[PDB]
Curated annotation (Swiss-Prot):
Function as written in the Swiss-Prot or TrEMBL entry: Functions as a negative regulator of the PI3 kinase/PI3K activity associated with endosomal membranes via BECN1, a core subunit of the PI3K complex. By modifying the phosphatidylinositol 3-phosphate/PtdInsP3 content of endosomal membranes may regulate endosome fusion, recycling, sorting and early to late endosome transport. It is for instance, required for the delivery of cargos like BST2/tetherin from early to late endosome and thereby participates indirectly to their degradation by the lysosome. May play a role in meiosis.
The family this protein is said to belong to: Belongs to the WD repeat WDR91 family.
Superkingdom, taxonomy of origin: Eukaryota
Protein name (database record): WD repeat-containing protein 91
Native source species: Homo sapiens (Human)
Subunit-structure text: Interacts with WDR81; involved in early to late endosome cargo transport. Interacts with BECN1; negatively regulates the PI3 kinase/PI3K activity associated with endosomal membranes.
Record localization: Early endosome membrane; Late endosome membrane
WD repeats by residue range: 13-52, 55-95, 122-149, 154-193, 196-235, 258-291, 298-333
Length: 333
């Protein structure tokens, strides 16, 4: 009963598997990035319409909408840079040099107050492969310099995912060593850290009331954690294996494509009561109360990343798959 499907449409401008697809802060624009460096910025009211296209030079690994100065997209590359992409002017404003030694920009989080961003900069993947050193850096957009290094204890490690709380006081992070680290933004040390997953942490998020954090990891678990009590599981659930991959699109050709999670694996409605996840044939929605309640379907290839935006009881669910197709499902509460 909780949701009714108003419609489902397909955005098909991408021709390679999707890496990231994120709705902007106004709920009206999508930025999506495929494994070939192609970025599309598009709208979906009341028709789908491409507002900008851009083919990236160098590999691109992360994508984050700026917070105060909307229409601005931050793109983290695989050559140790962050590119500021003006989706209105349809041009790159500048290319910020983060680090040559640790060129994989695996995560970007923009401060809700607009003056800084956090970025994960990781060593090249080892030739268990992501068990490599990483740094986590606070970058002052405004002097264009690195302001702060977060200490990663006990050792530097690649950070896969980051998320701010509403005020920007707290940053939750998930690492390739399975550890979750939670930072307050004046100090270099995490206020809190614990072993969360056996294998990599792929996505993290604060609950709506910011009393817990949610995580999803390589062990296939979705876990809710009390942030007043380090390592206190509030709850834990074993998801179907196609929620966490590795996602595989294969043919009789002897040919396969393999995607380890890189983009967001889970997304929530506005009030944090329901969770969208990946599966081989479309998005799957669960209820988070103290429970699969809707399957969105529509995909002929495995879904590898999702998003969910809410505007006033109208939700839109993005599901993105290895054939490059993005389905938009409109949900009414």
């Amino acid at each position: 009963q909780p949701f009714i499907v108003l419609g489902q449409e397909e955005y098909g401008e991408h021709h390679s598997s999707i890496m990231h697809c994120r709705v902007d802060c106004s709920g009206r624009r999508v930025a999506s990035l495929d494994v070939d460096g192609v970025i599309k910025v598009w709208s979906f009211n009341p028709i789908m319409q491409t507002k900008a296209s851009s083919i990236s030079k160098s590999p691109l690994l992360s994508l984050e909408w700026a917070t105060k100065r909307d229409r601005l997209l931050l793109l983290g590359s695989g050559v140790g840079t962050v590119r500021l992409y003006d989706t209105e002017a349809k041009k790159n404003l500048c290319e910020i040099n983060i680090n040559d030694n640790m060129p994989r920009i695996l995560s970007l989080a923009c401060s809700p107050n607009g003056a800084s961003f956090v970025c994960s900069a990781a060593a090249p993947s080892l030739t268990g492969m992501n068990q490599v050193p990483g740094r986590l850096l606070l970058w002052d957009t405004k002097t264009m310099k690195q302001q702060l290094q977060f200490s990663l204890d006990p050792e530097p490690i690649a950070i896969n995912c980051t998320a701010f709380n509403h005020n920007g006081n707290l940053l939750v992070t998930g690492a390739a060593d399975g550890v979750i680290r939670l930072f307050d933004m004046q100090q270099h040390e995490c206020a809190m850290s614990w072993r969360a997953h056996y294998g990599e942490v792929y996505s993290v998020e604060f609950s709506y009331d910011e009393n817990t954090v949610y995580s999803i990891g390589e062990d296939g678990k979705f876990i809710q954690w009390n942030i007043h009590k380090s390592g206190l599981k509030v709850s834990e659930y074993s998801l179907p294996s196609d929620a966490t991959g590795p996602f595989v699109l294969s043919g009789y050709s002897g040919y396969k494509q393999v995607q380890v999670p890189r983009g967001r694996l889970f997304a929530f409605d506005s009030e944090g009561n329901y969770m969208l996840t990946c599966s081989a044939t479309g998005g799957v929605i669960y209820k988070l109360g103290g429970e699969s309640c809707l399957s969105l379907g529509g995909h002929r290839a495995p879904v590898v990343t999702v998003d969910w935006s809410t505007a006033m009881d109208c939700g839109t669910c993005l599901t993105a798959s290895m054939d490059g197709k993005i389905k938009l499902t409109t949900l009414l509460a």
